[PDB]
Amino acid sequence: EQQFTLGRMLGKGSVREAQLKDGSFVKVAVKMLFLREAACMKEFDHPHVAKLVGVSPMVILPFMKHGDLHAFLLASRIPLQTLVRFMVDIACGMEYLSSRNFIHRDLAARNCMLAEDMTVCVADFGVKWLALESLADNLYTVHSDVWAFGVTMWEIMTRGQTPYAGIENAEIYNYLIGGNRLKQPPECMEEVYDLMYQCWSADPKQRPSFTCLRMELENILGHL
């Protein structure tokens, strides 16, 4: 298939803007690099998960003008209420995906997209976001998805900072095993950091579910 016109580069892994064609012309985004798993991912539908437009190899996703969450956070830096709502949005998307038995593996702010209405959707159906057992055993589960969510929470709170900035990738395992984590940002709400810290328990069963996270973030959102 080639009913779309490859255009300007959006990010570089390569993502490029394109123009998909019954009526007129729709602007999409094409990830340039399978069909069995894309048949499973096509069925997903939720206001906080980025839809699959299709596949062709390359992946066809909706074009989203406000770009990715990570750049947005960075752009602002160079209100807690808005930050907490971003987290709620990601949690809704993730709660949905894990309810469909989908393990994401690559959750990060860069993989979260700002929609037209400035809601955040989880994108990208598929070491600094990886749980200890993802690192030690290549075990990927809902619980390692929650670990990655917790790092994403930290990214939101620090407004786009690189996690473990003073530490090399090769030293991350060693850092974490020693019981060290990402430190509480200055002016970060205790309640926010507590929930985030819970996401990084060495014991994967001691990590909250996405339902639990959504509820406990939604609770915080009501105590504005």
Which amino acids are annotated catalytic?
106
Residues in the chain: 224
Q: Least separation, in Å, of the C-beta of 17 and ligand 0T8? A: 7
Query: Which of 36, 65, 205, 223 is the binder for ligand 0T8 (CB under 6 A)?
Result: 65
Q: List Cα–Cα distances, 191 to 79, 82, 95, 150, 196, in angstroms.
A: 16, 16, 20, 13, 9
Q: Which of residues 17 and 133 has its CB atom nearest to ligand 0T8 in the complex?
A: 17
42 annotated among ligand-binding-site residues: no
- The yes or no reply on residue 113 touching ligand 0T8 (CB under 6 A) is yes
| Spatial CA neighbour of 167 closest among 178, 157, 177, 175 | 175
Between 11 and 50, how does the x/- string for binding to ligand 0T8 read (CB under 6 A)?
Answer: x---x-------------x-x-------------------
Q: List Cα–Cα distances, 132 to 64, 161, 180, 199, in angstroms.
A: 33, 21, 12, 12
15 annotated among ligand-binding-site residues: yes
13 annotated among ligand-binding-site residues: yes
At residue 63, the 3 state secondary structure works out as: coil
| Spatial CA neighbour of 29 closest among 21, 19, 38 | 19
Query: Which of 53, 61, 107, 112 is the binder for ligand 0T8 (CB under 6 A)?
Result: 61
- The yes or no reply on residue 8 touching ligand 0T8 (CB under 6 A) is no
Q: What are the binding residues for ATP? A: 10-15, 31
